[PDB]
Amino acid sequence: DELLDCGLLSPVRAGTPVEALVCDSAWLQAMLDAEAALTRAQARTGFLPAAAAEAITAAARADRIDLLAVARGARETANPVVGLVAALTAAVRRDDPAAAEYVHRGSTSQDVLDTGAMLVARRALRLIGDDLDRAADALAALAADHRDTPMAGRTLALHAVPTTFGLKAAGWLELVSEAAGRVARLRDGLPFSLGGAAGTLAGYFDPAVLLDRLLDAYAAETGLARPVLPWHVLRTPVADLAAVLAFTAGALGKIAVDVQSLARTEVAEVAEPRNPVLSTLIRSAALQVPALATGLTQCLVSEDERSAGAWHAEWQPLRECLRLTGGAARTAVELAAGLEVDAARMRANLDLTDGRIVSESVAVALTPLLGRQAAKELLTRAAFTAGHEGRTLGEVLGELPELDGVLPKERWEALLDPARATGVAGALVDGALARR
Amino acid sequence: DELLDCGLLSPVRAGTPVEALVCDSAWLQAMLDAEAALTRAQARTGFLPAAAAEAITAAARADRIDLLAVARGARETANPVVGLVAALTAAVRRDDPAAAEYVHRGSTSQDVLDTGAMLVARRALRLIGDDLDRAADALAALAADHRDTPMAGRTLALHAVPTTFGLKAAGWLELVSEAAGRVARLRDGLPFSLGGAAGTLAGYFDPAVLLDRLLDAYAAETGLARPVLPWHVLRTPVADLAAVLAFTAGALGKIAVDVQSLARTEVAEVAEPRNPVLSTLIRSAALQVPALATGLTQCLVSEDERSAGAWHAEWQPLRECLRLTGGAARTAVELAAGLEVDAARMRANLDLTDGRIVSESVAVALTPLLGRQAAKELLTRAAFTAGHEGRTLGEVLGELPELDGVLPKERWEALLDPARATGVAGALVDGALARR
Amino acid sequence: DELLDCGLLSPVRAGTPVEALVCDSAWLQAMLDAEAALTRAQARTGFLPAAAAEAITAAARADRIDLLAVARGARETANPVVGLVAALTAAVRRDDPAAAEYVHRGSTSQDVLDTGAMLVARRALRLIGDDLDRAADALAALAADHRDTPMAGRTLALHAVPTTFGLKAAGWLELVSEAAGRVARLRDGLPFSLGGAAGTLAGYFDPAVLLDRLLDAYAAETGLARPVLPWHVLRTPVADLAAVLAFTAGALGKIAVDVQSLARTEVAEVAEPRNPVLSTLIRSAALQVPALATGLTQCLVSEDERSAGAWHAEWQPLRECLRLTGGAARTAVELAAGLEVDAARMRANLDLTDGRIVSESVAVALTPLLGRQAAKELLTRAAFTAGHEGRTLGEVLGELPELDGVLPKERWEALLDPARATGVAGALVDGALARR
Amino acid sequence: DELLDCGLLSPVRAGTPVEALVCDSAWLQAMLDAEAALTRAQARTGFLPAAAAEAITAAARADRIDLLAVARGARETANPVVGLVAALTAAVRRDDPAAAEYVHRGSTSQDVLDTGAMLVARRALRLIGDDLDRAADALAALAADHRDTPMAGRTLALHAVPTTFGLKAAGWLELVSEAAGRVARLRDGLPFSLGGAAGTLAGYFDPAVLLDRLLDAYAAETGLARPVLPWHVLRTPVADLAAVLAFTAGALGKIAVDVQSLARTEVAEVAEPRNPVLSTLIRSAALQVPALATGLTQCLVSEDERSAGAWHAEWQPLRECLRLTGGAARTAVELAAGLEVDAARMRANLDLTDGRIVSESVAVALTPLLGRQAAKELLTRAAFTAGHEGRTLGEVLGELPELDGVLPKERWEALLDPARATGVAGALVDGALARR
């Protein structure tokens, strides 16, 4: 039928857990959760009877509600909360006519919708963070295992100097760990929305005493944070979600394009657990989320006490950012857990420039006996000459009169070995891993 | 259930016709249409039997296929076409085992998916264009009716000089008409995708003769345009859809913010057919589509013969651009057909600056008798003085010695009438409407 | 001449201090600062003579260098550091031929360019943060002064319920204070770049001991933070700058569109220190920075050990984000310091809906005597009837039999007074201001 | 000094001709050109003396004006035209006091600024189009020369089937030719801006007769197109520039990433005229322009008769899009003219998958003797087995009993030759080149 979203156009998240958390029914449920938490908190502060709150809570179930009718009725007010409230009120009235007068008491559409949005975000970010933690575990393992696995460092698409795959993986780990930390902190900071019609909370009511009691109760009932001010037009939580999800998707995209560079036919230094489809999916989300994030970020420009459109522009892209990033994280776990590292092919590929990739380290080694300027000039000359003649760097070095007898044979064998010129990659990996 | 997309987060398109054209099932159907058209065209050029094409065509129905299984299986290849092909092949094999060997003959995932994407786009743009035409009809009617309806022209949020609502509406008409023309031409130019594994069409086969015959047949079977080259990495149709849909959404967004400016409480010069929810919905799409369009446009950077991610990043945002823009167009029709213009309130609001809004036209009128520089200086002085004293511009003018007896009384009454200083707005509306 | 950038196209920053911090000459100077700090730190750890570091430091002045030649020579390597290094080396060699062999010792283009970029960012963010602090001071003053200044709360462009300008200004304050805090923390966290050719630091050299000593020395010489890992392809600082500057520009944009809504001709509740040009300029930056930020954020996808283009795409938009946001902040200070609040016009505008804006608070007041449902129904009926008849809400209320003798006259006079139905706006302002 | 823009942060355009066309002084000159054209056209239609127009034209030179003062004074009105007009008026008054009364007669800031913007765009697009034409010439030459140069087609980063470099280059040609055509048509369609204070042209004046005469004269004096309506808030030309420049930058970005894929160390099939810096620069612009374009496109949402910020947000990004795209085009010419194609290395790389890259073409060849299903199964089996055993595809084929004596030896030698399985790449190149 025409109502099914199966993820047909978005394989990066199709079949992944985040789908179930951010589908339309889950958002309907989140808005019902926000209503019932509102009633319960109002009862806890004395504004209505506890039994009416229990009845509303019991009726506040997505299966009591006609999802399609609510969605299709929203065009009349440009949001779904008026229809939702009517449906919940009828559902409560069926079982408890006294309780129905307290459904949505003193409230406004945006408190319920935004509170539900932060509930959905909070649950979805719990999943994204747990997946980022698993990915980080597999990456830290790859980093420790390959601390001493040499490979060609590549800059501007060409071999530069040798590095280690452990160092590369530790950069991956650094990105994923940063993302998981930001996801956790953002999750702990998402607030409820309790402002009333235009942010004065007039319908919900020393004014300071009652404000404090109600705000504490609604924090307790929702599990969300208490904000200093109603934020109907202070869209900091939405901008923060946009920033954190675009950072996360971009970091995973970094891992994805590195994997694709290593996995291509004529490199073949890693393989995915034979197209590299996992990195293709991660990359697909990486090319989508930042553009959605900029629309989210632009909605900070929200006029008056409720914008005539900029708030409405937030819901779908936010959901999609949660969905895509969720898929990408799940896919990243599969990638980092399953990556196949071909150390021997990395070692072989180190020889592709016929010694030129160690010329910097040879220049350094010759600096005590030649000077820095003379050694650098001699080595760039030898690298060019070896490139033209299709000979090894060491071959051209063994023909320059200036180098005759300059170093013992064994030291030359050590110097021209690409696997030994990795700088301090080992110490850097140790330092990154001690942070865990 | 968790699979329902009801438009709960996107009221601008919930319940509108475009939904049915661009849902997941409609895309599945479009890919089946592309397969069956491929078989039929191959039969028309002699590469397989006509009966096998009829059998495949008959089986190529979305209700023969498990949508959810195809979507969930796509993670193995990062696209849904391999699973789709297996399901269609089984469905054909049930009724006709000989025909099943010709399902997806010589083809590749991207020919089918991209061809289906252009089928979906073509049908969705048929709807968007027809709606833009209806909106343009209502706007041209508003433009003709209010050719002589005076109102305050507003620049940088303040009254500037008088204009007419007919001229404003004719600008609306100009934008919508431009969009409808671009939608129609783009629709007539969307091509099929027939490239094979890496753009050589090797599996489908003077090579020029067979190429021409097959390309003509596939054009006939699909109704899509024949491209000069396979475009698996030449993403011009996608960039063009992105450009046209973002232009359309932005134009409708212009109408929406104008309506909101006119409809606010302390202006009240128009009303929607009492929050202005239609313009809120149009604006909501206007704040979403250009950001999706930039991701689409960036996918022009598609490496090799098939990108490992940038092509995959296109499907969902493209669908969403079609969906949102579709909603916005439908909503725009409702807005332009139902707008309530309060001419009397426009006339009253013209007097809000106490004559200052005609000071430019008074300066012009005094230029024969004072000079341009002296008249401009005198009128800015009088506008300031009238602003401070809370008096009419004409009051301050009737106290300057330099103006004593400068113009007859009746000419002053004509000059200070805001409804008569509209420039050539009437001629401009006539010129815009003669274009129809 | 053709080399002048005077801000002709960007008045929001033309003539503001940030220009001088982020112009081309300032970036040249920052890269020279990064070179000289590198030499000094290498001398402090024992790798070269202290006198050579003093000579390089003395020569490392933008006026010793041909800016235009460096910029125009950069096309050969796609960055300006090779030309810069040659020019600094010649300049040192003129005065001290021994010191010139240590210019750019063991270094790479990206360490110098990225370190200079973080120096520029750090200085520019010092200015942005100080300006945001001044703006926050003026906003907190407006919030305290107008805690009890009543005005129409506006939602979806229409009067909703009354609020106070103090509450509005306190939301402005909340945004600016959040931005200033994030700017300060980001500034304290920007790191230097010290990676070498491909992130192993091979040219700069227990390996852990020497790493730690050099990293500490370079932190001391630059004043920048020490990162856990070389970040040539771990673009977290750039993404963080993008996020913080787009948040800042959007927050200021919120203030700007609120000011424009209040300042328009038929509202006139505030005036800028007579077009509202300051808010126009702030808004102009708000519509630019988030789009630049998304390109910055997308550069997290940086392949290999140095991207062939994505790193190069960062410099100009980053500079522009610093520049625009800087202008916007400076302009925001001028706006918040100079805003003219017309309390009497706010009070008058409260009466524009002829009492309908207090109907919610009347419904609440009648709930003890009528019930919630009956009171809400009665008041929406009376609001409609009063709208049609062009009469006051209280007029229609005084004609319904159901309300006869329901409340004493004085209580009705209090109830229909828009200035008294502000909810708990006062307590909310007190709570926001106690945070200072 | 602090005013120099040398392109230090943007090597893709530093030292290229477009800089001189779009610098601040060039925009000042364009606005002076728009003023003088306005005076001349007004004289041609009879509204002022021809001699006053000649005097204004003679004084309307950027070297008569203080650029820095105009730019810095613009903060008072949020645009530079009031200061420009004062400076031009003084300059005319020095030589001709009578002519100075006709400077900026009946005009408004936006007519002059937007007309100058379209003058700058028109000249810059002349350059961009000529460069795109040169690039297209070199690409068509590469396409003809390498029509028969075989190479590995690569999809999702792996060898797929063989293609030709001629076909690849012909796709490059198709993109560049499309861009050059769109640039030329857009250039021929850019209009002047002549609206007056709020789009009625009241200050400039059968009203239809005078409108037509003045509009024709201003078209003649500017060389720009005559629009149907004043477009102060109908931002179609700006959106069109945004679309065309982002398309152009993305197309060139496609060529750039293809070059980088071919040029990397372990592929080495092409080389740039030894880092690939030209493609790095093109790519750098490709990652910048679409994000700037989305801000431009969003400015279609321009409220009232002149937006309080959205028009102001256009100037700098538009200039930058012109600048970057200009650089990219110039760089693309250098790249396409200088590319070094290593056909022998392409042929060698075809053998990297040990025959697996022809397995599809072997399957086709066996279909008459085995069936399609059986041949495909046999070849995927043989490809896997050959992959595991590190043997050639033909080796594993020569061991299956089912293939014994199936084809003569010579036919096997032809079949397993990667250079002969290119599909109809030759015919496709012929067809693309016949379009010239």
Side-chain angles (χ1 to χ4, degrees), chain A residues 77-78 104-106 151-158 160-164 167-168 170-172 174-175 178 182 197-203 205 207-208 215 228-230 233-236 239-240 243 246-251 253-254 257-258 261-262 283 286-287 290-291 294 297-298 300-309 311-312 364 367 376 421-425 427-429 431-432, chain C residues 77-78 104-106 151-158 160-164 167-168 170-172 174-175 178 182 197-203 205 207-208 215 228-230 233-236 239-240 243 246-251 253-254 257-258 261-262 283 286-287 290-291 294 297-298 300-309 311-312 364 367 376 421-425 427-429 431-432:
Chain A
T77 59
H104 197 70
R105 164 66 64 108
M151 72 182 295
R154 310 175 159 88
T155 64
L156 265 64
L158 308 174
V161 294
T163 186
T164 73
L167 180 45
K168 203 166 184 65
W172 297 352
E174 190 63 24
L175 292 174
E178 191 69 42
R182 299 169 178 213
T200 68
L201 292 92
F205 300 112
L215 292 179
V228 51
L229 279 176
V233 289
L234 316 170
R235 312 305 293 159
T236 304
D240 286 341
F247 175 76
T248 294
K254 194 267 187 298
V257 297
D258 280 1
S261 176
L262 299 173
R283 194 173 157 201
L287 300 174
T294 167
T297 300
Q298 280 163 352
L300 280 167
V301 178
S302 265
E303 79 282 1
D304 297 325
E305 276 59 49
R306 175 161 312 109
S307 172
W311 166 58
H312 306 71
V364 153
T367 302
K376 269 159 195 182
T422 65
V424 292
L428 287 164
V429 173
Chain C
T77 59
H104 197 70
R105 164 66 64 108
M151 72 182 295
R154 310 175 159 88
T155 64
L156 265 64
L158 308 174
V161 294
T163 186
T164 73
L167 180 45
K168 203 166 184 65
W172 297 352
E174 190 63 24
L175 292 174
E178 191 69 42
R182 299 169 178 213
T200 68
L201 292 92
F205 300 112
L215 292 179
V228 51
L229 279 176
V233 289
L234 316 170
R235 312 305 293 159
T236 304
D240 286 341
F247 175 76
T248 294
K254 194 267 187 298
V257 297
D258 280 1
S261 176
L262 299 173
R283 194 173 157 201
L287 300 174
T294 167
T297 300
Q298 280 163 352
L300 280 167
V301 178
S302 265
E303 79 282 1
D304 297 325
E305 276 59 49
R306 175 161 312 109
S307 172
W311 166 58
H312 306 71
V364 153
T367 302
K376 269 159 195 182
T422 65
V424 292
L428 287 164
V429 173

Side-chain angles (χ1 to χ4, degrees), chain B residues 178-194:
Chain B
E178 191 69 42
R182 299 169 178 213
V183 161
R185 289 190 290 281
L186 174 62
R187 171 178 193 260
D188 289 339
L190 295 174
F192 59 72
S193 186
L194 195 74

Side-chain angles (χ1 to χ4, degrees), chain A residues 217-254:
Chain A
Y218 201 45
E221 285 311 317
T222 61
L224 290 165
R226 171 183 169 173
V228 51
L229 279 176
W231 52 283
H232 291 167
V233 289
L234 316 170
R235 312 305 293 159
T236 304
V238 177
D240 286 341
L241 282 152
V244 175
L245 299 162
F247 175 76
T248 294
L252 303 176
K254 194 267 187 298

Side-chain angles (χ1 to χ4, degrees), chain C residues 326-339 341-359 361-371 374-376 379-380 382-383 386-387 390 392-394 396-398 400:
Chain C
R330 178 41 66 105
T331 311
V333 174
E334 292 167 83
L335 184 56
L339 196 63
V341 177
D342 196 341
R345 185 55 186 263
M346 294 173 165
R347 178 57 184 87
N349 285 342
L350 271 161
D351 301 326
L352 278 174
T353 65
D354 300 308
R356 297 193 291 288
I357 203 177
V358 297
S359 75
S361 91
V362 164
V364 153
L366 296 181
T367 302
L369 298 185
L370 301 182
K376 269 159 195 182
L379 261 304
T380 65
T392 299
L393 178 75
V396 176
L397 288 179
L400 296 164

